[PDB]
């Protein structure tokens, strides 16, 4: 939960929500 | 290594090794051998043998195996190298010049060649028709080299003892069957500081770029043939110049220039027993590599490159031919022992990595064929070999 991996870039929140 | 490269080829596909092949072939050099039937003796008109001088393979289609050999009596002999008829391989021969012949140059892609001689002339020989096309005249001392560009078959350059580089075009009309020059560079290699400020070797990099070397100048010069040097009353200035990279203070000169298939890399034999490898594309005028181990005492010693540009073979006054891997100049060379006198000219077959033709001063032309495996069925033990490849001490 550290800043090592959290906060990865997103274009829009819905690009893979229903893969 | 060779086996590892072959094994990994299917899995990883192709790769770039810095030369025009995908395998390290340094382990096969010891397999070169000259058979008893592969050694030819050049004979003069009187009967005594004469030393061959100048020998290279043709570029004509379906005829890339014939070899043209000249001697000091002016005879030009065409041998068949791939033929195994076990007879006289000299399929053609004719007296090209009354005096000595100092260079031959096959027309690219055609069965026509040019012989530059001591008659102060060059002669255009149509091999298939067995007739003389014409005579290039205008040199006044002695032609020393003749060069054709791989990209054109009508313009060739002749460098002579007078110090002139004479550019002839076969398309231009001949007044009386004698070709007149289309360009001329006078005093190309002159030491500003009897005269004999001769150019030794002239070579083509493009259809407009020419690389020339002198006999005492020590500077390798590059000329743009698009420019007109005939009107230049003053001393011409080369587009590029490679100064002498050595500590020797003598009148150093270069006996041979060789370009690889790409043309970017130039190998120059020097009188101080060195071979300097320069790059003709970059800004580095210093030698990229230095090869040594031979003896380039005379100007007759010449070198050649393998068809894949991997190896460089050079003659010597040591009475042997030295093969260096271009990628590793530091490694000891491979020595092609067997000649009884100075090895004058060498020629790696452009269409065959297996064949190397060495023309020496013991009146012998030797064709070295890569024989892999010394254990075979009976028939011939020692007489069937006259030369052998061994690692240098």
């Amino acid at each position: 939960m550290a800043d090592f991996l959290k906060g990865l870039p997103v274009y829009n929140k819905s690009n893979f929500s229903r893969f | 290594m060779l086996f590892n490269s072959v094994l990994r080829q299917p899995q990883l596909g192709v790769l770039r090794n810095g030369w025009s092949s995908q395998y390290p072939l340094q382990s096969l050099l010891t397999g070169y051998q000259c058979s008893g039937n592969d050694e030819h003796t050049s004979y003069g008109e009187t009967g005594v043998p004469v030393p061959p001088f100048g020998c290279t393979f043709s570029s004509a289609p379906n005829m890339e195996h014939v070899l043209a050999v000249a001697n000091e009596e002016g005879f030009v002999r065409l041998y068949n190298t791939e033929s195994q008829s076990f007879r006289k391989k000299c399929f053609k021969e004719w007296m090209a010049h009354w005096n000595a012949v100092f260079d031959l140059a096959w027309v690219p892609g055609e069965l026509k060649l040019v012989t530059a001689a001591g008659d102060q002339t060059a002669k255009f020989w149509d091999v298939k028709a067995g007739e003389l096309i014409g005579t290039c005249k205008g040199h006044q001392c002695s032609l020393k080299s003749v060069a054709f560009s791989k990209f054109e078959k009508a313009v060739f350059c002749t460098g002579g003892r007078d110090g002139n580089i004479m550019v002839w075009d076969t398309r231009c009309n001949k007044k009386d069957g004698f070709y007149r020059q289309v360009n001329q560079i006078s005093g190309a290699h002159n030491t500003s500081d009897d005269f004999q400020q001769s150019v030794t070797v002239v070579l083509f990099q493009d259809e407009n770029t020419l690389v020339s070397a002198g006999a005492v100048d020590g500077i390798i010069k590059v000329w743009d043939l698009r420019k007109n040097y005939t009107a230049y009353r003053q001393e011409p200035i080369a587009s590029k110049s490679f100064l002498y990279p050595g500590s020797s203070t003598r009148k150093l000169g270069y006996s041979s220039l060789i370009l690889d298939s790409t043309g970017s890399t130039l190998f120059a034999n020097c009188t101080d027993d060195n071979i300097y490898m320069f790059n003709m594309t970059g800004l580095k005028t210093s030698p990229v590599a230095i090869f040594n181990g031979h003896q380039n005492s005379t100007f007759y010693v010449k070198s050649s490159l393998s068809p894949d540009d991997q190896f460089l073979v050079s003659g010597s006054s040591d009475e042997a031919a030295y093969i260096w891997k271009v990628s590793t100049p530091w490694q000891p060379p491979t020595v092609l022992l067997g000649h009884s006198q100075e090895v004058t000219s060498v020629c790696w077959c452009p269409s065959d990595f297996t064949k190397i033709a060495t023309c020496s001063d013991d009146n012998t032309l030797k064709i070295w064929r890569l024989n892999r495996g010394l254990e075979e069925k009976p028939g011939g033990d020692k007489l069937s070999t006259v030369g052998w490849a061994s690692q240098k001490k």
Binding site: M1, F4, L5, K6, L8, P9, Y11, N12, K13, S14, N15, F16, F19 | M1, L2, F3, V6, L7, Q9, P10, Q11, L12, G13, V14, R16, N17, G18, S20, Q22, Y23, Q26, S27, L28, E64, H65, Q84, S85, F151, D206, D260, S261, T262, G263, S264, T265, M280, T281, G282, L283, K284, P350, S351, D352, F353, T354, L370, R372, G373, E375, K377
Partner: protein
């Protein structure tokens, strides 16, 4: 007779070109993947990766970059081919038609210059001012990016540093700047230059040149907030920006080299790093602000995110999803979780894209023994090795067109049934319930039902008609009960629900407001069908009532009202066809007789009488065949029911017999679910079998396979496999992964005492080679035999030798050592797989590497390095030398046919020998004299010989026969030349289609399948001279008419290419271009063949129409 037809059956799958950006538009994220000559564009959508457009370059993509010049709304694409054909492409959508256009093109090759060792490097200025290329040593090609440059005119800048490893364009620099790592005798250095377009030269450079680690590999240009560059060599990562210098040496990186990199955050904080071992790392660029204003790097940290497939690409798309582009294995789409799992790894695979990878070896086998071959290939390398099988093809029980929805159709609720019992099943969409109903009876079974109107479903049973339902709630369509018979040989449709019951029969049309009496005459015989075949979507409107008579099946067609037998036409299949049902294709309906045993009959149905049409013959299995027309697409094709059912598909007038992808079924009712028509609720006779030109089955091995051979006697595959093992001073050697060789039912180790002829380090990676015996059904490793230490198995053959009835697995191996350029010891071991064990028979130590082995005439001929040997299998089961041939460098490849032998050399071209039985030794019949650097060979005819160059070329050499008696008979003349563009690895003889009716004057003779390193499979088939000339004219006209995507000349692309010669291609026909004739519009089709003469009926050559040309092209593509 050397005229060949090369067509790619499977397109390349290995990924080498790779980008992401806004290509299709300025709003949708795109992923562009280039696999050799193929470029595919995907739009990242909510569902996932949506295919958008696939195009074929006329070249091998080496550089692909996405750049947006100022003003342009969407990114343009820069593509450079291996032949230096630079082009700029823009995606242009016309509403429905989808095109990508070439805004600029040009060749950038130079006549002087040695190609660089580190390959082609292509970079774009961050401000899109220029394009930089590193093609040759000592030069840097610069293409100005002005809009005037429609021809891509470039200029070359000469630089002192001849050997350049990698060059990148820096960020945040006013003038364009390149930062590159170069190698000189002093070591490796990093240097910066400023490119001046006005001066066309290199200026000083923003910052100095520093000495970097001796193994620096590639450069990353950090974006504006940080600036500078990152040099990631072996065991070291450095950051350079002016005076700022950061260095780290993480222990994790030193294990294997970093191959690929990608940028996760636009500001450059995070990067993804690939590896040769497949592990995925993340590199962190920690930042810190100096009070206010400029921000500076503080520290460099790398973290091991996890393990992926061996990656040629890392590409972060969005939402924590990374595309991993694999060249040695299947590509992946993985997700970076914020937290790890058991055996901590932050990478979880979401999707796998199949890649055939490097096809090292392959074989064509008929496992089913029906007649259609299958391709089993050795694919992948290292941990990605697999055994892909390529095949060409396409109690709940009941069958009925239950029209629950009068217009929506499909199906919501069904009825389950046992053998003799039935019960309505409550399929409330995706869920079912099993609750008994009091009002129903579950002691009888129903085989066929239907719905007419108002959802009037009626329960059907032998005793009577009873209904307890929810939608119908009434027995309106009352089916009569004359004698209470079961539902057998009866056909009913939606319009009427009629089953064959009793014998006192009148027409059954008991439905509201009509009572038809078509069948009024007394008829004792039980007719299988008493319905009509609709033409299209019509219901209740039969164009004709003629179905023929089952008794005789006369060719002349009789209308039902007339009921008079026409002229007799006896057919070979006197036995009546099992089931005759009319099937209506896209616009074509045909009369097909489904005779199960054989003698199938096809006819065309014309109006009224209908006369007769052409007949066709295709054999089937000894099983009853039922014609089942299925309505699930614009083409309402039919479904066969034989041992190997054929789902025939329609063409202009030639229907193709596509094979089903399952084993076999008897009576199945397909579901028309548009979501997944392939996966349905289909049952079987006793089980529940649920159910794309090519189908690929993957059998992971977790080790690199080398060779494969099939043994039908033992029904097993012998596979040569290699395992990478790390060796430690303690414990001997430990395996990296539980691979296939370790995971075997029974295992054995080789024990040969003849190889008495070294200690490695404590971390040396050794290779352990095994022969795996794999079952052909379960594809599991039945046995695994491990060879000796430092012994590599190169060749494998399964054959019967001499007079021994037993079939042997013969493996040629060589003992390899680190200090030997060439192996000097080898073995030819013989195994017999009797029962679960690989018993050893003979050893036959040899002095060299056995590169390839072929069974010749009951004798084994092997290729020790620089030797071709012949071995006799004596009665004492020991190989004995017979004859030798030495005149070769190395006999890498051996192929034979009859008494002739083809030998491939590492330098020299193919060599043709011939065993002479009388004297008993080889004789060099002929030898090609053009140096070609063989990669694979194949013998096509007794004259033509096929060879593959290592420079992605194909050629055919012909044994001259018209030559006069001389040494000129000893020359193999290279008569056919072609530039395939793929590195062919294996040649094989066979086909993936049905091997029947091949003698009907087929245009192509023979069939050769070649598998390449990029994962593509191709077909080479010989053509006749006239057909070759016609195809060559077609090729020229198509090249004139159609436009390449990069405006690349097809003749330039296909021309034979090598570092020395660039001869144009002759004696070869591009199958892809020929087949592309079917994809051009009809006006464009008429533009082609405008003035072409075709001699179809006879010697006269009429003005060829488009229809004849379509016929020719489709007949050509049938074999593909």
């Amino acid at each position: 007779m050397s005229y060949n037809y090369v067509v790619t059956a499977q397109k390349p799958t290995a990924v080498n070109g790779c980008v992401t950006g806004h290509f299709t538009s300025a709003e949708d994220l795109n992923l562009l993947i280039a696999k050799n000559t193929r470029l595919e564009i995907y739009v990242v959508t909510a569902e996932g990766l949506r295919p958008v457009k696939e195009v074929g370059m006329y070249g091998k993509i080496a550089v692909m970059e996405l750049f947006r010049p100022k003003g342009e709304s969407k990114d343009l694409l820069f593509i450079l081919t291996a032949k230096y054909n630079a082009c700029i492409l823009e995606y242009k959508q016309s509403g429905e038609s989808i095109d990508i256009i070439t805004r600029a093109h040009g060749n950038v090759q130079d006549r002087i210059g040695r190609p660089s060792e580190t390959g082609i490097i292509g970079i774009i200025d961050p401000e899109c001012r220029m394009i930089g290329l590193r093609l040759y040593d000592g030069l840097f090609k610069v293409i100005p990016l002005d809009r005037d440059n429609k021809e891509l005119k470039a200029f070359n800048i000469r630089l002192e540093e001849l050997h350049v490893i990698d060059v990148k364009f820096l960020y945040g620099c006013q003038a364009p700047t390149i930062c590159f790592v170069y190698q000189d005798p002093q070591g490796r250095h990093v240097k910066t230059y400023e490119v001046s377009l006005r001066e066309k030269e290199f200026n000083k450079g923003p910052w100095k040149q520093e000495n970097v680690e001796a193994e620096a590999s590639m450069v990353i240009a950090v974006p504006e907030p940080f600036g500078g560059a990152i040099i990631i060599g072996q065991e070291s990562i450095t950051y350079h920006n002016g005076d700022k210098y950061l260095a780290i040496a993480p222990p994790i990186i030193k294990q294997s080299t970093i191959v690929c990199h990608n940028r996760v955050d636009p500001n450059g904080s995070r990067y993804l790093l690939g590896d040769m071992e497949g592990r995925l790392f993340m590199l962190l660029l920690e930042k810190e602000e100096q009070m206010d204003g400029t921000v500076t790097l503080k520290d460099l940290r790398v973290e091991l995110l996890g393990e992926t497939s061996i990656a040629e690409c890392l590409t972060y798309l969005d939402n924590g999803v990374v595309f991993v582009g694999s060249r040695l294995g299947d590509s992946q789409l993985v997700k970076l979780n914020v937290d790890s799992n058991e055996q901590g790894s932050y990478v979880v695979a979401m999707e796998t894209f199949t890649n055939l990878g490097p096809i090292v070896d392959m074989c064509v086998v008929d496992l089913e023994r029906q007649g259609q071959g299958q391709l089993v290939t050795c694919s992948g390398a290292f941990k990605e090795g697999s055994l892909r099988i390529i095949r060409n093809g396409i109690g709940i029980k009941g069958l009925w067109p239950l029209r629950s929805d009068p217009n929506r159709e499909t199906d919501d609720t069904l009825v389950l049934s046992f053998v003799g019992q039935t019960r309505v099943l409550m399929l409330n969409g995706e869920e079912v319930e099993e609750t008994e109903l009091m009002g129903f009876v579950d002691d009888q079974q129903t085989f066929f039902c239907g719905n007419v109107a108002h959802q009037q479903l009626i329960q059907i049973t032998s005793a009577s008609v009873r209904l307890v339902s929810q939608e119908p709630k009434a027995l309106v369509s009352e089916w009569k009960e004359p004698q209470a018979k079961n539902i057998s040989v009866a056909s009913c449709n939606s319009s009427q629900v009629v089953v064959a019951v009793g014998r006192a029969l009148y027409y059954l049309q008991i439905h509201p407001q009509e009572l038809r009496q078509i069948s009024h005459t007394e008829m004792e015989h039980e007719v299988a069908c008493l319905d009509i075949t609709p033409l299209g979507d019509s219901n209740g409107l039969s164009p004709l009532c003629a179905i023929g008579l089952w008794t005789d099946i006369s060719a002349r067609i009789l209308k039902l009202p007339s009921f008079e037998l026409l002229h007799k036409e006896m057919l070979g299949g006197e036995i009546i066809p099992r089931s005759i049902l009319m099937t209506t294709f896209e616009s074509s309906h045909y009369l097909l007789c489904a005779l199960g045993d054989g003698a199938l009959f096809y006819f065309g149905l014309n109006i009224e009488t209908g006369l007769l049409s052409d007949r066709k013959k295709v054999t089937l299995g000894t099983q009853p065949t039922v014609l089942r027309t299925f309505r699930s697409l614009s083409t309402t094709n039919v479904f066969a029911c034989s041992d190997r059912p054929t789902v025939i598909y329609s063409s202009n007038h030639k229907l193709v017999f596509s094979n089903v992808n399952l084993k076999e079924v008897n009576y199945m009712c397909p579901l028309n679910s548009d979501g997944y028509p392939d996966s349905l609720a289909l049952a079987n006779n006793s089980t529940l079998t649920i159910g794309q030109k090519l189908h690929i089955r993957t059998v992971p091995l977790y080790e690199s396979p080398r060779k494969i051979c099939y043994q039908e006697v033992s029904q097993c595959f012998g596979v040569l496999s290699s395992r990478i093992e790390v060796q430690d001073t303690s414990g001997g050697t430990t395996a990296l992964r539980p691979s296939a060789s370790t995971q075997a039912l029974s295992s054995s180790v080789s024990s040969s005492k003849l190889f008495s002829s070294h200690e490695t380090s404590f971390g040396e990676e050794v290779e352990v080679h095994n022969l795996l015996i794999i079952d052909q059904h379960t594809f599991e490793v039945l046995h695994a035999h491990q060879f000796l230490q430092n012994e590599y198995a190169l060749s494998l053959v399964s054959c019967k030798l001499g007079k021994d009835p037993n079939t042997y697995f013969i493996v040629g191996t060589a003992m390899v050592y680190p200090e030997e350029a060439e192996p000097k010891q080898g073995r030819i071991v013989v195994f017999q797989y009797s029962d679960g064990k690989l018993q050893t028979v003979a050893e036959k130590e040899v002095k060299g590497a056995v590169y390839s082995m072929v069974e010749f005439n009951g004798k084994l001929l092997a290729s020790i390095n620089s030797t071709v040997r012949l071995y006799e299998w004596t009665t004492e089961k020991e190989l004995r030398t017979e004859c030798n041939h030495y005149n070769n460098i190395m006999a890498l490849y051996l192929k034979t046919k009859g008494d002739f032998i083809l030998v491939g050399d590492l330098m020299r071209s193919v060599l043709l020998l011939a065993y002479k039985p009388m004297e008993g030794n080889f004789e060099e019949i002929a030898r090609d004299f053009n140096p070609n650097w063989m990669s694979a060979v194949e013998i096509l005819d007794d004259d033509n010989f096929l060879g593959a160059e290592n420079a992605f070329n194909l050629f055919v050499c012909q044994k001259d026969s018209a030559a006069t008696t001389d040494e000129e008979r000893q020359h193999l003349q290279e008569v056919g030349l072609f530039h395939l563009g793929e590195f062919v690895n294996v040649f094989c003889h066979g086909s993936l289609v049905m091997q029947n009716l091949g003698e009907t004057s087929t245009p192509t003779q023979g069939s050769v399948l070649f598998g390449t390193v990029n994962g593509m499979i191709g077909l080479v088939t010989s053509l006749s001279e006239s057909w070759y000339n016609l195809l060559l004219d077609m090729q020229n006209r198509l090249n004139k008419v159609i436009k390449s995507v990069g405006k690349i000349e097809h003749s330039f692309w296909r021309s034979f290419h090598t570092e020395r010669k660039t001869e144009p291609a002759t004696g070869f026909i591009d199958g892809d271009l020929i087949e592309s004739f079917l994809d051009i519009s009809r006006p464009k089709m008429q533009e082609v063949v405008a003035n072409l003469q075709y001699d179809d009926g006879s010697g006269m050559k009429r003005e060829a129409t488009a229809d004849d040309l379509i016929k020719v092209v489709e007949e050509l593509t049938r074999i593909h």
